[PDB]
Design a protein around this nucleic acid. Structure first.
Ligand SMILES: Nc1ncnc2c1ncn2[C@@H]1O[C@H](COP(=O)(O)OP(=O)(O)O)[C@@H](O)[C@H]1O
Ligand code: SF4
Ligand code: SF4
Ligand SMILES: [Mg+2]
Ligand SMILES: [Mg+2]
Ligand SMILES: [Mg+2]
Ligand SMILES: [Mg+2]
Ligand SMILES: [Mg+2]
Ligand SMILES: [Mg+2]
Ligand SMILES: [Mg+2]
Ligand SMILES: [Mg+2]
Ligand SMILES: [Mg+2]
Ligand SMILES: [Mg+2]
Ligand SMILES: [Mg+2]
Ligand SMILES: [Mg+2]
Ligand SMILES: [Mg+2]
Ligand SMILES: [Mg+2]
Ligand SMILES: [Mg+2]
Ligand SMILES: [Mg+2]
Ligand SMILES: [Mg+2]
Ligand SMILES: [Mg+2]
Ligand SMILES: [Mg+2]
Ligand SMILES: [Mg+2]
Ligand SMILES: [Mg+2]
Ligand SMILES: [Mg+2]
Ligand SMILES: [Mg+2]
Ligand SMILES: [Mg+2]
Ligand SMILES: [Mg+2]
Ligand SMILES: [Mg+2]
Ligand SMILES: [Mg+2]
Ligand SMILES: [Mg+2]
Ligand SMILES: [Mg+2]
Ligand SMILES: [Mg+2]
Ligand SMILES: [Mg+2]
Ligand SMILES: [Mg+2]
Ligand SMILES: [Mg+2]
Ligand SMILES: [Mg+2]
Ligand SMILES: [Mg+2]
Ligand SMILES: [Mg+2]
Ligand SMILES: [Mg+2]
Lengths: 582, 184, 96, 258
RNA sequence: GAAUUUGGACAAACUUGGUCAUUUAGAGGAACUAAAAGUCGUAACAAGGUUUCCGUAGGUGAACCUGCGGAAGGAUCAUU
RNA sequence: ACCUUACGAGAAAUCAAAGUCUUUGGGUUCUGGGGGGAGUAUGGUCGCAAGGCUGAAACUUAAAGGAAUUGACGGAAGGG
RNA sequence: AUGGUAGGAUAGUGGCCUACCAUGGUUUCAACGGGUAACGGGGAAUAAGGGUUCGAUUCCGGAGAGGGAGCCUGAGAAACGGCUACCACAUCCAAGGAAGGCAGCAGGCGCGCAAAUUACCCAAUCCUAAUUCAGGGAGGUAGUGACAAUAAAUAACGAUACAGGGCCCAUUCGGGUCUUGUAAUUGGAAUGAGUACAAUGUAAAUACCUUAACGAGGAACAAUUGGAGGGCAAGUCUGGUGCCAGCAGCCGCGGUAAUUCCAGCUCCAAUAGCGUAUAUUAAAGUUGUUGCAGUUAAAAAGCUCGUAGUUGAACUUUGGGC
RNA sequence: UAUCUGGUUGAUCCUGCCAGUAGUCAUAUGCUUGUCUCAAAGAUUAAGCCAUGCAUGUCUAAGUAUAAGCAAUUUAUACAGUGAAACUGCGAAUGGCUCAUUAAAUCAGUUAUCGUUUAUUUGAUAGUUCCUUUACUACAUGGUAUAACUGUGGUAAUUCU
């Protein structure tokens, strides 16, 4: 019931010799329309995507197998698992949990990946598309007859399964505590639910050593995520969910974050997670499950694949198992020179912060990146003066916090309407981004992922002296990262301003880097900043400081991590060249 | 795979669909015997056709022939046992002269009516179907039962029923519940 | 199954004065062109364009049926919905 | 193809086992043994379907592994061991002794025999030749090889086999006036005296045979088993004594006792 | 006793042809059927206004016409 | 070859065979299976040629046909 | 290619192969070629008798594992849930290399007019192994399933009002017993469909069988599918359209009075089933052995000779007696 | 269950076909669908292509055990109970699936091996070997390995090693 379209391959279509039998055959061409435009001199036949009914007559009538029918995503009104409400988002399939193994969910944000995990956990019992009269468990199980999920859901009713989710919203969890106020450790202590010595010591692995003693509220997003993982890992549960674990983590932590999740695995246990970063997923998942569909309208879960084949399908955008194309193919002086609290000395070191030419500013987790950006905004002063007040900042907090009953389009009036010129100005930048959808919705119950996108547009608005985008990588999908990086890029040529981007990712950083403030230093103990080093030099230093090497994929230029002891990785340390495409 | 289950079809529709004589004949049969469709009459005419074909195959054989003696005596015995064939007419030529009313008098519906426990063929049908009838000590709720003429003495009401006693029934117990409710 | 090419107004043979309301359809398995007669009163208002129709013979074992010159097939379903269900308003069509 | 078959579907099993066509896709394929798999009876179908001492093949295996049943004096804890014609089967619990003889309907009978009779069996000699170092031997119908036999024993005779030793007690020759058992063919189960045998050089010697009610018949020499002289047989015959009443006389006899 | 190696039979395949059994395009023809209130005549049905038909040959806007031999299915069962 | 019967036959005209054929078997060879398309295409084969002999299909159609009857008409013959 | 003699190879026989030799072998009684929408058989459907059509598919035999070819191991394989190469697809890759074979069971794509669950289990049937014990998508169990097949609910019974025979009467149009059916007339009884303790069922369940408790009666627990000119059951209707729209397998209907369309009413046929398309069988003595036809309807070759084929007079031991 | 009927004409009798009529372990499709038993089911087109998981393994008193495995003893300082791995032995050639090929081929019934291979099963069956045969020796019992294991490693990756 999927829409079917005929695609023509550039290989093995040869119009000069073919006698254009595809064109004569077509019924839509007979009714008058130019469904297939092809002449003997032409390079390739063209088939209109929207003027093809997908009958398949052309495929049979070609001398060559140049034509092929593929499917397209569509609303199906069948095999529905869940509707939230009337004229609301529809979840068609349900991923099947695999024992012993990691099962990754990949898709655009807003497609129902988070909806799947709640359903599997038992948090959100499915209604099979009946919001008005939700069926009870007896009816859900009989829907699931003939499947492994029937036996899996029967066990949950009998309390044979314990299932824990690791929430995708870091921001929500500090608000709700066991008590009025507590430090990090006593939360862990009561719910250790595991002997510390006998099992592998996650706290040493999850780099929580210093932060056992801080109160939970002071922690940044970067630290907090590794705490969230720690609460799930300490639990003894049959099934383990991890929602967006990559967020607010640097490259070394992400590899360790991959390491911790797999260590949970046992023959009885189940581990299923939704991770957006492609590169970590190589070391995270045995199997990859693609979800697809128009965002916030419908979502369809597909058959699993092995990671190597699974990731390559996602980058390709054409699942071969189900013959559909789901169409996502990825492709001045300011010498502050100190700031302390007495405990974490972020001694700054002199910089010529350049003119009108975008700069990354990249650190590690405890290395206190925010302190510099807090200091460029005047706040968190040095003790012994030498504080320059010159710069005017359009910053955007890492912990974005909603305080107002605002519809988006009115928030467009309130601060960012400005002059709103049509060419090359805020109208132009919005068009790639899907912000035209979200204007109706309330910001308070705008989604966390979308709330990041609104903040990114919100901050770019006021030119001031210098907008400083802080950490724009979180809560975005793969595709949305590619769009966002270019949309920042196109804008920031037009203004003669600069920006210090505070990424914990690497690939967006490399795309959005002209000069690199490096942050060598022990994390979560006294650091030392350095100068805004040039691109090839600046990645390599940080790459030296972690013993991580990146390889340039031949076909698609995708940056993939090397194994820790391997021929290429050994070669690039000896050559000194930790990175490419400089 | 396992051995296939044998099945066979038990009736046959007539050749000309719309012929007024045969229609009026089968409606007279259905009204007099209390039947619900023409499939029952087609079932009996099929069974009678099979009996007549076996008897036709034996009468071509000469007398004193061992197959004719064996299977003629067996077929005559089965017909006199179920009561379709009278005790005097036992000569395999009377077998050919049988007709469907001879079979239709032996169903449990018309036997329950003839024994007088019913007052109608339609009352007999619903008495059978609603399990107030027992041909031995065993309930039968099939109207086409073809009683075997020593079972005719034993058709009576079921012991686990009203009309054979020891508990009245749903609507009687409800009405008694209402009258005991009004008394208290 | 086939794809509707156009709608025809074939006039009946003598003596019969009518317009018979058939369609041209290109078969999906062969690519062959075929005329099919849309049976009932008003049922040509379902069979509009580029549709998946299902076709059967008329019963005359390959012969043209009536006063209708030269059609050998009738329409059974259009867009997955049967034509009598559309005609008796038991069901109704999808958009396309 | 490609090698020997190990399964045996039901509806392909021999009809005289009387295995019902439902309750399973397979039948117990007889393992290689002293008898051909068509003219044999596995111990599973004898213990379960004929004697009803078990309800499952699992129970037949449970009976067999405690060494209860023994066939021709040897223990044989095998589920599909082919027990054939004239084999003795000893069940020491219940102290029972069976011999596999045919009833006249052509099926294997539950023929209970006494303890003196279980000490022997008859065998029809299939070939007499000279083995190595010039030692003669006979081969009986269940494949027993017996060395240094009597020189008068030629083929199609019956030798009485001792079953504690493998020795030969005595033997019945082949001529007219001899009591025979028909094991094979249409007339399987009938007992009659031989009147004369037809030479037929080149294949399939026939023999004419008449029972006690003077009904003659004829059989190939492959299916005939001499069991003694007229009057006494050398074994105990089952009920019916191989008479082959017709179906007319059979329902008359059934309406006597009913 | 491993790599390697000589001859052989078995032989998948490959390259250059050449046949046949299969499709497409195709200037043009060339018919046939159905439906068609068209154009010109009136060949057949009456001795249909030159009896009709057959075979063969030639001719002609079209039916058709004409020569030669035949048939009655003719318009003659018939002239001791 | 003819005349007369109709034993008989046949749809009838008519037939001494076109009879002895549902009461169905003397021997044997050839041909037909609704009307067109069509004795046409195509391939063989014979012929100097003209042509002969073999010989379809797609498609199309509800009749085409036989013998008699009663009318109507005839540039057919008689009568009133 | 057909045979002869020697050898070779084989488990063995043999042009199976080689060397030498001879010129054979098949065919109108249809060889050889072509086609098969051709695996063969038991068998299936439909037939008075004779037949005709089908058989991929529960059993038996064969063959194959994407296409070909080659081989190891072993008693047994030219094995594909074994290996080797080529051809065709196709995956991963760090570009060095590596791994493939669902015409097994589920499942997916594609194709189409067309066909089910990525469930439970070895409890039964049996098979394998060192073996009673382990294993088995073989096999069983439930799911889906109007493919066919069996049985068989959708109501039964009164009391009173309405349309009927001789007679008790021999009391003219008065009760009407003895019935037959209609009722904007009322009554209780009866029961499953369904729901559900329980037990049984089962490897564990589900369901069946049994059974407390509940569960009926007219807007409730409401049977359809095709038809009503003829063939061929069923309109002496009423509105609508007006050679249009449409119906009609065939003949035909429709231009103001439509027995045929579109509807209402009524009625008929089969009925948990009924209609349509395609194919096939009977009807078909329209394939004709039984058993057709050939003057004119289709059809006796222009005429004779003639080989194969088919068909060919009569005759030989009978009668008698126990 | 040995049956026909409508349509060529102004009417008739025929030839003759078309149409109806009944069935189908023949498919499909439409409309409709309460109950019990029973049951086929990706053959037809594409022997087209396959994501994922499973479908072939196996232990007895009775081949090999020092697991640095688990147990409890009390026979037993050589072992002796239970039992992973691994070696050895068997099995994986059966079953299941499908119907492409194939027209004297397969197949069916009927023969033959006096023309041959045969694990297994079952029954029989082996005083002869001190190879130079007075010792040249072990026959109250002869030689090597090698796995699992232990330890050191390579590769992005494999049931690699
Ligand atoms: N709790 C909810 N109630 C209603 N609608 C929701 C809810 N959660 C999500 N949605 C809508 O449906 C979609 C579900 O996807 P979501 O749960 O966000 O997973 P993902 O992270 O893959 O988008 C969202 O895009 C959102 O628009
Ligand atoms: S397959 Fe397409 S490109 Fe090739 S000849 Fe045909 S129409 Fe032209
Ligand atoms: S699939 Fe059909 S409509 Fe689309 S291009 Fe091909 S012939 Fe045209
Ligand atoms: Mg989410
Ligand atoms: Mg007409
Ligand atoms: Mg066996
Ligand atoms: Mg003329
Ligand atoms: Mg004229
Ligand atoms: Mg003229
Ligand atoms: Mg004339
Ligand atoms: Mg005429
Ligand atoms: Mg030789
Ligand atoms: Mg030779
Ligand atoms: Mg084939
Ligand atoms: Mg096929
Ligand atoms: Mg088979
Ligand atoms: Mg094979
Ligand atoms: Mg394949
Ligand atoms: Mg192979
Ligand atoms: Mg396989
Ligand atoms: Mg499969
Ligand atoms: Mg109706
Ligand atoms: Mg109608
Ligand atoms: Mg009407
Ligand atoms: Mg009528
Ligand atoms: Mg009508
Ligand atoms: Mg007939
Ligand atoms: Mg015909
Ligand atoms: Mg005829
Ligand atoms: Mg003529
Ligand atoms: Mg003629
Ligand atoms: Mg002539
Ligand atoms: Mg001729
Ligand atoms: Mg001759
Ligand atoms: Mg002859
Ligand atoms: Mg005419
Ligand atoms: Mg007329
Ligand atoms: Mg017909
Ligand atoms: Mg096999
Ligand atoms: Mg032995």
């Amino acid at each position: 019931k999927n829409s079917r379209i005929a695609i023509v391959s550039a290989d093995k279509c040869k119009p000069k010799k073919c006698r254009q039998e595809c064109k004569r055959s077509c019924p839509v061409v007979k009714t008058g329309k130019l469904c297939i435009e092809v002449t003997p001199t032409s390079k390739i036949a063209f088939i209109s995507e929207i003027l093809c009914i997908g009958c398949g007559i052309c495929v049979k009538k070609c001398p060559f197998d140049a034509i092929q029918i593929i499917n397209l995503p569509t609303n199906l009104e069948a095999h529905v698992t869940h509707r939230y409400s009337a004229n609301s988002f529809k979840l068609h399939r349900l991923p099947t949990p695999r024992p012993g193994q990691v099962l990754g969910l990949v898709g655009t944000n807003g497609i129902g990946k988070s909806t799947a995990l709640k359903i599997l956990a038992g948090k959100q019992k499915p209604n099979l598309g009946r919001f008005d009269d939700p069926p009870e468990w007896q009816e859900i199980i009989k829907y699931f007859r003939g499947s492994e999920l029937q036996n899996y859901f029967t066990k949950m009713l009998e309390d044979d399964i314990k299932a824990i989710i690791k929430p995708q919203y870091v921001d929500n969890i500090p608000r709700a505590i066991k008590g009025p106020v507590q430090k990090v450790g006593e939360l862990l202590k009561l719910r250790m639910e595991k002997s510390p010595e006998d099992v592998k010591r996650y706290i040493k692995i999850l780099q929580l050593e210093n932060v056992l003693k801080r109160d939970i509220e002071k922690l940044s997003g970067g630290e907090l995520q590794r705490f969230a993982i720690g609460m799930s890992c300490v639990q003894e549960a049959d099934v383990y969910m991890f929602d967006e674990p990559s967020s607010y983590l640097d490259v070394k932590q992400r590899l360790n974050a991959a390491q911790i999740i797999r260590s949970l695995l046992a023959p009885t246990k189940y581990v299923i997670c939704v991770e957006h970063d492609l590169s970590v997923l190589d070391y995270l998942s045995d199997f990859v499950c693609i979800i697809y569909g128009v965002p916030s309208v419908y979502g369809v879960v597909t058959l699993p694949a092995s990671v190597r084949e699974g990731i390559n399908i996602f980058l390709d955008g054409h699942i071969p198992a189900e013959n559909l194309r789901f169409r996502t193919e990825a492709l001045f002086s300011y010498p502050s020179l100190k700031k302390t609290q007495g405990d974490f000395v972020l001694n700054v070191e002199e910089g010529e912060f350049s003119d009108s030419e975008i700069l990354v500013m990249m650190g590690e987790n405890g290395t206190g990146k925010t302190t510099l950006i807090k200091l460029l905004a005047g706040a968190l002063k040095p003790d012994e003066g030498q504080d320059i007040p010159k710069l005017n900042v359009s910053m955007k907090p890492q912990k974005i916090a909603p305080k107002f009953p605002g519809t988006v389009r009115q928030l467009f009036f309130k601060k960012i309407r400005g002059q709103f010129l049509n060419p090359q100005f805020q109208t132009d930048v919005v068009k790639p981004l899907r912000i035209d959808d979200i204007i109706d919705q309330e910001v308070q119950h705008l989604s966390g992922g979308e709330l990041q996108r609104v903040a990114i547009v919100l901050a770019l608005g006021i030119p001031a002296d210098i907008y400083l985008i802080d950490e724009p990588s979180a809560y975005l999908d793969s595709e949305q990262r590619i769009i966002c990086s270019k949309v920042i890029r196109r804008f920031i040529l037009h203004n003669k301003k600069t920006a210090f981007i505070v990424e914990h990712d690497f690939i967006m950083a490399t795309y959005l880097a002209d000069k690199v403030i490096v942050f060598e230093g022990i994390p979560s103990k006294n650091a030392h900043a350095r100068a805004p080093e040039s691109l090839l030099t600046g990645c390599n230093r940080f790459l030296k400081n972690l013993n991580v090497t990146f390889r340039r994929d031949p076909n698609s230029f995708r940056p993939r991590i090397n194994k820790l002891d391997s021929q290429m990785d050994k070669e690039q340390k000896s050559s000194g060249n930790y990175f490419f495409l400089d | 795979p396992r051995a296939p289950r044998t099945y066979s079809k038990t009736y046959s529709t007539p050749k000309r669909p719309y012929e007024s004589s045969r229609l009026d004949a089968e409606l007279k049969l259905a009204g007099e015997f209390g039947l619900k469709n023409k499939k029952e009459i087609y079932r009996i005419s099929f069974q009678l056709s099979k009996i007549r074909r076996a008897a036709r195959d034996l009468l071509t054989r000469d007398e004193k022939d061992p197959k004719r003696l064996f299977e003629g005596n067996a077929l005559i015995r089965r017909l006199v046992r179920v009561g379709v064939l009278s005790e005097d007419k036992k000569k395999l030529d009377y077998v050919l002269a049988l007709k469907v009313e001879d079979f239709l008098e032996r169903r449990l519906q018309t036997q329950v009516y003839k024994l007088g426990l019913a007052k109608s063929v339609h009352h007999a049908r619903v008495l059978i179907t609603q399990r107030h009838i027992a041909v031995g000590k065993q309930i039968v709720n099939i109207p086409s039962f073809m009683v075997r003429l020593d079972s005719e003495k034993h058709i009576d009401f079921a012991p686990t029923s009203p009309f054979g006693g020891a508990r009245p029934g749903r609507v009687a117990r409800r009405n008694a519940a209402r009258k005991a409710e009004a008394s208290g | 199954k086939g794809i509707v090419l156009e709608k025809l107004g074939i006039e009946s043979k003598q003596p019969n004065s009518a317009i018979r309301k058939c369609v041209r359809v290109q078969l999906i398995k062969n690519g062959k062109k075929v005329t099919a007669f849309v049976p009932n009163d008003g049922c040509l208002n379902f069979v509009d364009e580029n549709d998946e129709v299902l076709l059967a013979g008329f019963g005359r074992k390959g012969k043209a049926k009536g006063d209708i010159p030269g059609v050998r097939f009738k329409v059974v379903k259009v867009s997955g919905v049967s034509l009598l269900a559309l005609w008796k308003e038991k069901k109704e069509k999808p958009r396309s | 193809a490609r090698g020997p078959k190990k399964h045996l579907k039901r509806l392909a099993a021999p009809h005289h086992w009387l295995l019902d066509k439902l309750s399973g896709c397979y039948a117990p394929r007889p393992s290689a043994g002293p008898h051909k798999l068509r003219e044999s009876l596995p111990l599973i179908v004898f213990l379960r379907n004929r004697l009803k001492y078990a309800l499952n093949g699992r129970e037949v295996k449970a009976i067999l592994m405690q060494r209860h049943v023994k066939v021709d004096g040897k223990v044989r804890t095998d589920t599909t061991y082919p027990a054939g014609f004239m084999d003795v089967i000893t069940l020491d619990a219940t102290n029972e002794n069976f011999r596999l003889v045919y009833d006249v309907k052509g099926r294997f009978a539950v023929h209970r025999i006494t303890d003196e009779e279980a000490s022997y069996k008859l065998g029809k000699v299939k070939k007499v030749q000279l083995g190595k170092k010039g030692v003669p031997y006979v081969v009986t119908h269940d494949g027993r090889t017996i060395r240094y036999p009597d020189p008068n024993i030629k083929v199609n005779d019956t030798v009485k086999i001792d079953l504690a030793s493998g020795k030969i007690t005595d033997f019945i020759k082949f001529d007219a006036g001899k009591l025979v058992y028909v094991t094979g063919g249409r007339n399987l189960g009938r007992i009659g005296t031989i009147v004369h045998k037809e030479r037929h050089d080149g294949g399939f010697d026939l023999v004419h045979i008449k029972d006690s009610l003077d009904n003659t018949f004829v059989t190939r020499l492959n299916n005939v088993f001499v069991i003694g002289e007229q009057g006494k047989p050398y074994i105990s015959l089952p009920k019916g004594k191989g008479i082959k009443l017709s179906i007319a006389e059979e329902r008359d006899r059934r309406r006597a006792q009913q």
